[PDB]
Write a protein that binds this ligand. Sequence first.
Ligand SMILES: O=S(=O)(O)c1cc2c(O)c(c1)Cc1cc(S(=O)(=O)O)cc(c1O)Cc1cc(S(=O)(=O)O)cc(c1O)Cc1cc(S(=O)(=O)O)cc(c1O)C2
Ligand code: HEC
Length: 108
Amino acid sequence: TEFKAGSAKKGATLFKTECLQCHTVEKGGPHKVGPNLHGIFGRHSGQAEGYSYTDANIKKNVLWDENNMSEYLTNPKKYIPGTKMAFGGLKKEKDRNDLITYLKKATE
Ligand SMILES: O=S(=O)(O)c1cc2c(O)c(c1)Cc1cc(S(=O)(=O)O)cc(c1O)Cc1cc(S(=O)(=O)O)cc(c1O)Cc1cc(S(=O)(=O)O)cc(c1O)C2
Ligand code: HEC
């Protein structure tokens, strides 16, 4: 995948509709169905403190960046078979770029 910097404004809306159900982004924010996402970029997968992950999410051991995040969010179970993230994916390229542009800011 080839991430291109988009609109964090549009991305914030996408996060609210597609992700917020299962995730928070703020430092010190709570785990929900899914892990809090603060500090995700530049950290290996399956490491949010206090959250119990699948073996698949831990053993993937991917250093998250904008490009591999874009592949993951296209089709989560295809990138990490055995995941328990029940999200089908964002099939539209502009949606992935906008979402990731937001996530880079919101998880810092
Ligand atoms: O910065 S903005 O988010 O406000 C913006 C709005 C519009 C834009 O046309 C663009 C930016 C430029 C643009 C960027 C990209 S990116 O490189 O992926 O970031 C892609 C496109 C684009 O026009 C092409 C494009 C793709 C899609 S997709 O099917 O979802 O992948 C939809 C659209 C595209 O133009 C339609 C579209 C949606 C939107 S939306 O408000 O985000 O829904 C704004 C604008 C649009 O032209 C009108
Ligand atoms: C619940 C129904 C979810 C929705 C909707 C989304 N996510 Fe999720 N995510 C969820 C779980 C249960 C998990 C852990 C999965 C496991 O196998 O253990 C995740 C994981 C992620 C990750 C990886 C985190 C890590 O520390 O490696 C990311 C980056 C992630 N989720 C992001 C994300 C985004 C951006 C979403 C909206 C598009 C989204 N998720 C939806 C549960 C759920």
